Amino acid sequence: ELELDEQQRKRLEAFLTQKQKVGELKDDDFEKISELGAGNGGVVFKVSHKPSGLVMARKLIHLEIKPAIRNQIIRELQVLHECNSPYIVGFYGAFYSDGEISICMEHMDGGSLDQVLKKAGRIPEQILGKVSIAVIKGLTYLREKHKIMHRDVKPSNILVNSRGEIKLCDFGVSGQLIDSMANSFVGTRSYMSPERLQGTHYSVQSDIWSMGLSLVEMAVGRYPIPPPDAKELELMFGCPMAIFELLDYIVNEPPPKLPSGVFSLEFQDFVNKCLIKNPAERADLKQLMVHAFIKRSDAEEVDFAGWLCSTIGLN
Numbered sequence: 001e002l003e004l005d006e007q008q009r010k011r012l013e014a015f016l017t018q019k020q021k022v023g024e025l026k027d028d029d030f031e032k033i034s035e036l037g038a039g040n041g042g043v044v045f046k047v048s049h050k051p052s053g054l055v056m057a058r059k060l061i062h063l064e065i066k067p068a069i070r071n072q073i074i075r076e077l078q079v080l081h082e083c084n085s086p087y088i089v090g091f092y093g094a095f096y097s098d099g100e101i102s103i104c105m106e107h108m109d110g111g112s113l114d115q116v117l118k119k120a121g122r123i124p125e126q127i128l129g130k131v132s133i134a135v136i137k138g139l140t141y142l143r144e145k146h147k148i149m150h151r152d153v154k155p156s157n158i159l160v161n162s163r164g165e166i167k168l169c170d171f172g173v174s175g176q177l178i179d180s181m182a183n184s185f186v187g188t189r190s191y192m193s194p195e196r197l198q199g200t201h202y203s204v205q206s207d208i209w210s211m212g213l214s215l216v217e218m219a220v221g222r223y224p225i226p227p228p229d230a231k232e233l234e235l236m237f238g239c240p241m242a243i244f245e246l247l248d249y250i251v252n253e254p255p256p257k258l259p260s261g262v263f264s265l266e267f268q269d270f271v272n273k274c275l276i277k278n279p280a281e282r283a284d285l286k287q288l289m290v291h292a293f294i295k296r297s298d299a300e301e302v303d304f305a306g307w308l309c310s311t312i313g314l315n
């Protein structure tokens with residue numbers, strides 16, 4: 001079902017051309033522009049690769065490890081050079097330098113949806129349609145051309161840009177990078193399915209739960225767990241829990257849902273099918289890829305770039 005258009009083939013072609021113009025990467029080739037902040041590993045800076053004049057994002061994961069460890073990581077991250085999706089963030093290269101592991105990737109001027117969320121208050125449902133399509137197409141590609149799941153779907157990992165593109169970032173490609181990162185950062189488990197917080201069976205089904213929950217959070221403008229009272233719903237529309245306690249609530253108590261009336265029933269059904277605690281009953285990608293919400297969303301011509309630029313004040 002993975003089919004492209006002319007505008008998408010055109011953009012994918014240009015990126016490859018830009019990428020080929022860049023040779024081997026070295027600390028001394030990079031000039032810092034600004035900071036895009038932490039960061040599921042370490043820090044993220046918007047940088048300029050001086051020789052090529054390109055603008056990239058550079059992830060600095062400070063790990064004072066031996067030359068054996070780092071070289072194995074780079075070898076695994078080299079797989080991403082084969083990666084060609086309009087739904088996955090572009091990769092330029094990886095390398096070690098005096099303390100840190102640098103990962104260079106395509107710059108996204110919209111930044112993360114966690115950032116877009118803070119500004120917007122709450123993201124409108126028609127916009128979440130486009131996002132849902134994009135996350136689905138992304139995860140579908142990750143399973144196909146790269147036979148690996150994302151393992152980390154959260155608003156902070158969905159990246160957007162002024163051309164209206166939506167792409168995925170910080171998905172486990174290097175097994176040894178995660179291994180040495182046992183200390184070190186450790187990504188938030190608040191978006192993990194109630195089966196991953198039980199260690200039991202985890203496929204693309206955990207990615208779908210993570211998506212549904214990201215979607216709920218963006219729609220209401222708050223992390224959904226624990227469900228707020230109708231008094232916080234009057235405050236919101238009109239129409240302090242610790243991490244270990246929160247994770248115990250996920251596995252034990254009923255899943256979050258969108259408030260009634262405010263949202264459309266297709267969209268409530270969509271998220272409901274993503275947040276079914278049992279993975280066997282939870283919707284798979286094929287099912288989701290043809291759900292009424294997705295069909296309707298694909299058929300709407302939603303001006304995403306327009307909305308975005310106005311919301312984050314681009315320019």
Ligand SMILES: CCOC(=O)c1ccc2n[nH]cc2c1
Pocket residue numbers: 036037038039040044057089105106107108109111112156157159169170
């Ligand atoms: C998840 C860690 O990556 C980031 O925080 C991030 C932010 C903005 C970006 N633009 N292009 C790539 C980016 C990566």
